[PDB]
Amino acid sequence: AKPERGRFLHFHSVTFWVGNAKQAASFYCSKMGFEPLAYRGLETGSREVVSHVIKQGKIVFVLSSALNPWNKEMGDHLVKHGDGVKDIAFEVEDCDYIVQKARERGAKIMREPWVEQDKFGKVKFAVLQTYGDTTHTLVEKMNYIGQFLPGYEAPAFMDPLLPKLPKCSLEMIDHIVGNQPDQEMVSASEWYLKNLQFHRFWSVDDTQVHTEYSSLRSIVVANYEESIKMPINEPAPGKKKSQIQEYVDYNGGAGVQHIALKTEDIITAIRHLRERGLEFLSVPSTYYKQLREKLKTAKIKVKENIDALEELKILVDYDEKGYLLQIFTKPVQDRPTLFLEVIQRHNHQGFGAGNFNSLFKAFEEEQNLRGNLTNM
Amino acid sequence: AKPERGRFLHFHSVTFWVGNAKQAASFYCSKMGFEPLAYRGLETGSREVVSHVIKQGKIVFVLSSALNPWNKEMGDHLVKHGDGVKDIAFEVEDCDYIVQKARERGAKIMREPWVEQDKFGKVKFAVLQTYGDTTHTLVEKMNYIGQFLPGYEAPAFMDPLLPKLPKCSLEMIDHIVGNQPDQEMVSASEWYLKNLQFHRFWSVDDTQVHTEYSSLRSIVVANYEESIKMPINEPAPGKKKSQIQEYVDYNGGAGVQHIALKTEDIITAIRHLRERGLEFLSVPSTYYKQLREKLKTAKIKVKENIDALEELKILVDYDEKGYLLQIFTKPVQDRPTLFLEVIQRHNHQGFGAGNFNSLFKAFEEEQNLRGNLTNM
Ligand SMILES: [Cl-]
Numbered sequence A, B: 001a002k003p004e005r006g007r008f009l010h011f012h013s014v015t016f017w018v019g020n021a022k023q024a025a026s027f028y029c030s031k032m033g034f035e036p037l038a039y040r041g042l043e044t045g046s047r048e049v050v051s052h053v054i055k056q057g058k059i060v061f062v063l064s065s066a067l068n069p070w071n072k073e074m075g076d077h078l079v080k081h082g083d084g085v086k087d088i089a090f091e092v093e094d095c096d097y098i099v100q101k102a103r104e105r106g107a108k109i110m111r112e113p114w115v116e117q118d119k120f121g122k123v124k125f126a127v128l129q130t131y132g133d134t135t136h137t138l139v140e141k142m143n144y145i146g147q148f149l150p151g152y153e154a155p156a157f158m159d160p161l162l163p164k165l166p167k168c169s170l171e172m173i174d175h176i177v178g179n180q181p182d183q184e185m186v187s188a189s190e191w192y193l194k195n196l197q198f199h200r201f202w203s204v205d206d207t208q209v210h211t212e213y214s215s216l217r218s219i220v221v222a223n224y225e226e227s228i229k230m231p232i233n234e235p236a237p238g239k240k241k242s243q244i245q246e247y248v249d250y251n252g253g254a255g256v257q258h259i260a261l262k263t264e265d266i267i268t269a270i271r272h273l274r275e276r277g278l279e280f281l282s283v284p285s286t287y288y289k290q291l292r293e294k295l296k297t298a299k300i301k302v303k304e305n306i307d308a309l310e311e312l313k314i315l316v317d318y319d320e321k322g323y324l325l326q327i328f329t330k331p332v333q334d335r336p337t338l339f340l341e342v343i344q345r346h347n348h349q350g351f352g353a354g355n356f357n358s359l360f361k362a363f364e365e366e367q368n369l370r371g372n373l374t375n376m
């Protein structure tokens, strides 16, 4: 059923609340191939919050910190979560309708619609509360031709190391995953269906994704046109603690687990990300032997050199029409909370339970290294 | 008067409490030429605190974060200060004497002497409280031949970008500066004299270091053998706010303002630091014209090419026997608290009021950019 009005066009940006915005922006630029896009802070008249905005392709990350001692909201969030995602922004049409419908349906509107303006045009915003402390900012451009948004200026500094580093080829945000406490997958996913008129796109249960020790459940929600996809996970039964529970343990509650970044040349992307010093999970050699055998009878043909996929530890899954290439980074902070994913799609716009299982097992290895794969 | 017993050999290390230890270590390695030395965290059995230890020459920085939500001590310090220095460690002989004398003299002993042991030998430690929330850890090696200390293991990861970046040539910690609130310079410096049997090494007042708008006072304390030098600053009068007060405003109290790192090849160091993307303060062109004229009658001869010093914005000061080359970085976080300095000494083991004045003016320019050079 197509929503009567409104559209969620694409992910706009992801806002992180971090301990040191300057250093965080530096990390993502150096290690992951981002470049500075915009800035606000003391030098631009923003006296409570500093933000470094960085971009790669269509991907926009906003790294923000408090400027003053004893900031209650940002300081509490920092002590609770460590560095992590605060807001997932969507570019929309008809923000007014979307907010009114969401309110009538029971969503909490943290910030009522407001308009900001600069010499490049106007932008309308609204803020809704989703799971945990995570929010969604709705962004409706009203003939806006600026490079980012009102209230942000050119970058504080253009680091001269960045043009010397190899291009990472990341193009856009593919999906974003939210981990929930035990028995909160349904409520957190229903939020989207009820309030935003998203629909259920995919799901897996603990009979599909599990190791000998642990498991999860997941429901993926999507907007009508399926340009926005968000898996929602919860822990599920096993002899040992689910990695989704490890996340909740270290995050202090629900929150964003991973942001997946799409590329059209994953071999180049991962080679270059590794050259820049980014770490990824691993996969046993047996996996690639099994893959080569299974590919002999698959209806699809993988065009990437399997030797390169093996060397780079990329995971392959397929249906009868196309295939998916996926790899997870190690967590981007010491708490085992947030990490990122690189994904390439070949005539496949969904998810694969094979890759979900393989990725789950690769993460579980690290969970056990951390001493957190403990008997229930 | 030589202390009856005990010796403070050298700075051992500086411990930072930061929001994201992994990213911070990455910043210092990439931008400033450090390499990983050691690690403790979940994978090594340290379940409350993660630490990434990095080294360059004799310089050792320890970047630490809390691993769990709602860590009181580290979380409060993070919200109060942002990322910054928690502890300045000294390598000592006769830790027992030093602690007992300090206690008798009135110092607060945060942690009584204790011994840790591994297969490389034993190390004795003690912790004393200095200004603000800053502590000193005393480190006495007892036939210890390990690369760092007990309780830390090999690095979590050796980033493969680092060997590809140019060498920064930093050798050892030269001095560390503590900024105090109004009228606390004397008490904070006296702490060293009374408790540790340091002595006054140098001082300047607001008649020596000032611009048209602002000023400071400083007292430098040193150990008997003068291997350890620590300037202690306070704000002083002016039409506008002192940069030392700006620090206190943003730090929430007293704390470390800058760590100075010594090099024997400052031209190479600064060229390579700039290539890696580190930002430094600036100096007007007039300064170098004046310098060239003054050098015509100086008793010393500067061996570095003055054109290179000008291009790199290095500041020169001298007495009749030798000279000092100094440059400040921009702050290493968005709050204008901590920054670093690179220093080269040529037959000059003290400080120069000329350079102190020039460095003060260079910082004041940035303070004004931040909107913090406000009328008193
Ligand atoms: Cl099974």
Ligand SMILES: [Cl-]
Residues within 6 Å of the ligand: B210, B211, B212
């Ligand atoms: Cl004057």
Ligand SMILES: [Co+2]
Residues within 6 Å of the ligand: A175, A177, A258, A260, A341
């Ligand atoms: Co994913």
Ligand SMILES: [Co+2]
Residues within 6 Å of the ligand: B175, B177, B258, B260, B341
């Ligand atoms: Co200095």
Ligand code: NA
Residues within 6 Å of the ligand: A010
């Ligand atoms: Na599109």
Ligand code: NA
Residues within 6 Å of the ligand: B010
């Ligand atoms: Na020595």
